C-alpha cells in the first residue's frame, strides 16, 4: 500500500551512516575515561575537542574540581577504538619492552629473583596496552585564532601503558598569555 | 536552552481538537489499536504517501531552493565566516523544514481525512454500520491511527533531505561551487550523516497528533452539507498549531542540537 | 540575478483551467457593485481575519522562540558582530516569515473559500440560479471574492510584523535583549522604508494570486463531496508553486537580495 | 467537565510544569546574588562569564551605579552548588584553621571560655568554604579579542556568609588601557 | 469568554506595538538631552551607546 | 466588513517607514552635483555612504570610469541634514566673504568700478555658495577594521565655495600601499 | 544662594572621552562626572576632554 520510492529514499538515508557512524558515534564502546589536573584555563568547556599531534581524537567528558587545592580535575573522552598496539603489534612489544628492561643497569645488577619479574611486567603491560603509553605531555592550545581552547596530547617516551582510570601529569595548563604580559 | 519547554506549553495551552473525542481515542487504546494491510490502510497511505510523492519531489524541491537563496545571500553579504553549509543545513533540517512538512499532513492530509469520514457518516459506511453495531472505532479509526506512524514521519525527513539534494543542484548555478566541496564542507560543519539518520523520531508524536485532531472533526460531525463544511473549516483551526510540542526536545537529542 | 529568474518561472506554470475565468473576474461589478457586511461575507472575514489573529500571535511565538535560541547560539559559534537580532531579525522580517504567511493564507483560507463556493453549485445558490439565468458571476464570485482579499495583504505583512513586536517580548524573557537596540537594529538591518515597504507589494501579489486560483475550481466543481476534495487538492498544487516563483523574483527585485 | 472538555486535566498538568522548567530551576537554593565594587571596567555585559580558577561558576546579574562617587556595585548570579569537603576532611580543615588561631600567643593556651569563641570562629571559617564565599579576590581578564570579558576569582580564606551589598576585595576592576596606548 | 483573553494578550500586545517607535519615546517622557561639540569621531554612530565607568546609561539621539 | 486591529497595525508600520525613508532621500533638492577623480578605491558602490569625522553627510549618486585618463568619476548626493544655509545665515557668510574680498590686496588696488562688483560676485553666486568650502580633503576610511571601505570627505579651507560642476582635488585617494608593503 | 543652587540634584558639569567599546568601532562615550550647578538636562554643557585629536588618522595618511 506504499510506493517504490519509499523504500529508495529510505536506502539513500541508510547509506549516510554506513561509515560515518562507525567513526563518530555511541559513547562508551569507543572511548576510555582518563583524568588529568589543570590549574587555570581561559576558555575550557565540557565537550571541547581534544587532539593528539594535530588530529582530533575526542572531547572533554566532564569537568570537576579538587577542593583541597581548588584546582580542576578534567575527565577525558579519548579515542578508544584506536587500539594502537593491537594483538599483532603486541608480539613486537613483548620483545621490545623486554629488551629495554633486560639491558638496563637496574636489572643487570639485580637479584636473579628480581630479574624474573621482568616478564611479570610484560604481563601487566598485556592487560593495559590498549590506547597510549606511560609518558604523555598535556598542554593547552587554541582551536581557532581568537579564543576557545583545545587540549593537546604529545606522546613522550615511557615504559608502561595507560588506560581508563589512570592519571597523566600536567605539563602546561597554567600560563595565560594575558597574565604573562600584565604580571 | 530555556526554549525547550516553552515550545511544548504552547501546544498544551489549548487542546479542543482532541478533547471532545478523547474518550473515544482512549477506548481504542483500551480495546487495543488495530494493525494490518487493509483497505483503510490503502486509502490512508494514498493521502499521506501517493499524493505527497509528487508534492515533495516538485514543490519540496523549490521550497528548499528558496531557503538556499537565503543561503546564497549570506555568501554575498558575509562570505567566509559562514561559508558553504555553515548556516544553511544547520537550520534547514533541525528547525525550518519540519513546520512546512507538518503543513502537508496536519493541513492537507488532515483536511482530506476529515472530508472522507464526515461523508461516510452521511453515506457509504458509518451511516448504516453504527446502526448495525459493527464497532465504529475498530472499523475505521483504530487501524488508521496505527497507519499514521508508518510512512508519514519518514516523509518529513525525506522532505528535508530533498533540500540537501537541491543544495548541490544549484551550488554551481548560483555561483560556481563544486558540489563535492559544498556537501562535504556542509557535512563536517553540522555532522550531517550521523545526525540526520538519528533524527527520525521528531515527528512520530506529530503523526499521532495529526490523526487525533483530524479524526474528531470527521467522526463527530453533523452529517449534513452545512455541518460537514463547517467541520472542515474547524480542522485547520486546531490541527495547524498543535503539532509542534517536541521540536527542541528531540532536536537537542536526536539531531544533536 | 538570472539564475534567480530562471528558478522563478513558476508563476506562469500552474495555470490549468484557471485562465478560462478571464472575463469572468472582470465582470463582477458589471451588474451593480455591492458592498457591506453580509451573512457569508463576514464569515469569510472571520476565516481570513478574526481567527487568524490568534494564529498569528501563536505561530509567532513558535517561530520567535526557535530563532531566539538560534540568536544565542550564533553568539557562541560565530560571534558578537552578528549576535542576537543583528542577523536573525534581518532574515526573519525580510525573507523568511513571508513564506509561512502565504502558506497560512493562500493555502489555508484560499482552499476554505473554494470549499464553500463548491457547495453553492451542489446545493444552495447556483444550482437553481444558473439554470434560470440569474447572472452567475454576480451570484457567487462578486460577493465572496472581495471578502477574502481586502485585509489579506495587510495581514500577510502583519504576520511578520508581530514576529518583531513579540520578538522583543521574548528577546527579554529568554535573555534580556534591550527593546530599543532591537528596534533600531531592526530598521538599519533591512533599510525598512525602502525594502520592507516594497515587501508590502510582494504580499499584494500574493493576494492577487488568490483571485485567480480559488475562483475557477469552486465555479466549475463536480457536485459530489469527492469532487470537492479533488478541487481542494488542486488548489494546494496551484498555490504552492505560484508563491515560490515570486519568492525568487520579488526577493531579488522588491527587497533587493 | 469530564467530557467534551476532558482534557482540561491534560491542559492544566503540563502548561505550568513546562513553564517553570524553562523559566527557572530553581537557583534559589543553588545560587546567591552577591555583590562587588568595580571602578572602571569597559564593556561588562549582562550574562558575561564569571569564573573561578578558569571554570565558570556564574554570570553577571545587574549593575547598580553611584554618579556622585563614580563607583559601580555589580551584582553577580553565582552558583552555590559547587564542590566541598566531607565530614572527616572538613574536620582537618578546621583543625588547620585552629592552628592558625592558636599560632598567636593570646589564644595558644586559651581559656575554655575563649575557646568557645574560637570554635565559633571555626564555624565562621567553614561557612565560606562552599556556599556563600566572603573572603576572595577579583580581577578582570579577556577571553576573546578585547571584548568578551572573562572575570576571574582567586579564593582566599573564609569569613561567615557574605552579605548582599558587602564588597569583594578588588584586585583589578579598572579595565581601561587607552592611556597605555596613548602614553 | 474570548474577550477575557483579549484583554490579557490582545491589549498587552497593543501596548507593545505602540512601544516600538514610541518607546520612550515621542515626547522624551523618561529621558533628557545633552549637547557637546566634537571635531573627529570616526565610529560614533546614531544609537551608539553612552556610558559611565564602562556601564551604559544612555545613547546617541 | 473588516476588523479594527488591521488597520491599527498598518499605522504602526507607517511610523517605522517614516523614519528611514524620511531620512534617506531627495537628490538635487538638498545638495548639488559635484565630481571628484579617484585613482584606486576598493569597492565603492553606487549609493554607498559618504562620511565626515564619522558622520554620514551624503552618498554616492553614481560611479563611472574613464580608462583613457585612467581615473574614476564619482558624482555625489548630499543628504538633508544640511540643505546649506538659512536666509540670514546665507547673508552672514556673504558678509564674511565680502570682508575677505575687501581685505584682499587684489581688490584694494582695483579700479573703483571693479571694487563695486565685489558684492555683484556674491549676488551672481547666491546659489553657488551652497555649500561647503572650495578646498575639500579626499581619503578612504573604514567602518570596520580594514574592510568596509567608507569614503570620507572633510572640507578644509579654500578661497571660494565648492559649487556644482567643480572637481574636488584628490589628496590621499591614489596611494595603494600594498606594493609598498610587499616590495 | 550660590551654595544652595550649587549642590542640588546629580551634578551638571561632566567630562567626556572618545574610545571604542569592543574591537570594531562603535565609539563608547565615557563620562566622568565633575562638579556643576543643576540637574543635567537640556540647557547644560558637557565639556569635551578627548574628542578632537585622533592620532591614528595622522599615522594612516
Author numbering:
A (entry chain C), D (entry chain D), F (entry chain F): 9 to 191
B (entry chain G), C (entry chain H): 1 to 257
E (entry chain E): 9 to 69
G (entry chain E): 131 to 191
Question: Can you list sentences taken from the study reporting this PDB entry?
Answer:
We performed a genetic screen to identify genes important for the OM barrier of A. baumannii. This led to the identification of an ABC (ATP-binding cassette) transporter complex that promotes GPL export to the OM. The A. baumannii operon includes: mlaF and mlaE, respectively predicted to encode the nucleotide-binding and transmembrane domains of an ABC transporter; mlaD, encoding a protein containing an IM-spanning domain and a predicted periplasmic soluble domain; mlaC, encoding a soluble periplasmic protein; and mlaB, an additional gene predicted to encode a cytoplasmic sulfate transporter and anti-sigma factor antiagonist (STAS)-domain protein. The results of the stable isotope pulse experiments in the ∆mlaA strain revealed results consistent with those obtained from ∆mlaC and ∆mlaF, in which the ratio of labeled to unlabeled GPL is consistently higher in the inner membrane than the outer membrane after one hour of exposure to 13C-acetate. These results are consistent with a model in which the IM-localized ABC transporter complex MlaBDEF first transfers GPLs to the periplasmic binding protein MlaC, which then transports GPL to the OM, whereupon MlaA facilitates GPL insertion into the OM. According to this model, ATP hydrolysis by MlaF provides the initial energy to extract GPL from the IM, while the substrate binding components MlaD and MlaC take up lipids for delivery to the OM.
We next used cryo-electron microscopy to characterize the architecture of the A. baumannii MlaBDEF complex (abMlaBDEF). Following 2D- and 3D-classification, we obtained a final dataset of ~14,000 particles with which we obtained a structure to a resolution of 8.7 Å. Based on the bioinformatically-predicted localization of individual proteins and work recently performed on the similar E. coli Mla complex (ecMlaBDEF), we propose that MlaD localizes to the periplasmic side of the IM, MlaE forms the central transmembrane region, and MlaF and MlaB form the bottom layer on the cytoplasmic face of the IM with two visible hetero-dimers. We note that a clear six-fold symmetry is present for the region of the map attributed to MlaD, despite the fact that we only imposed a 2-fold symmetry averaging. We next modeled abMlaD, using an evolution restraints-derived structural model of ecMlaD as a template, and used our previously-published EM-guided symmetry modeling procedure to model its hexameric state. The localization of this extra density suggests that it corresponds to a ~ 45 amino-acid insert present between strands 4 and 5 of the abMlaD β-sheet. Interestingly, the arrangement of MlaF clearly resembles the pre-translocation state of MalK. The resulting MlaE dimer model fits well to the EM map density, and clearly corresponds to a closed transporter, with no solvent channel between the subunits. Interestingly, we also noted clear density for three TM helices that likely correspond to the MlaD N-terminal helices.
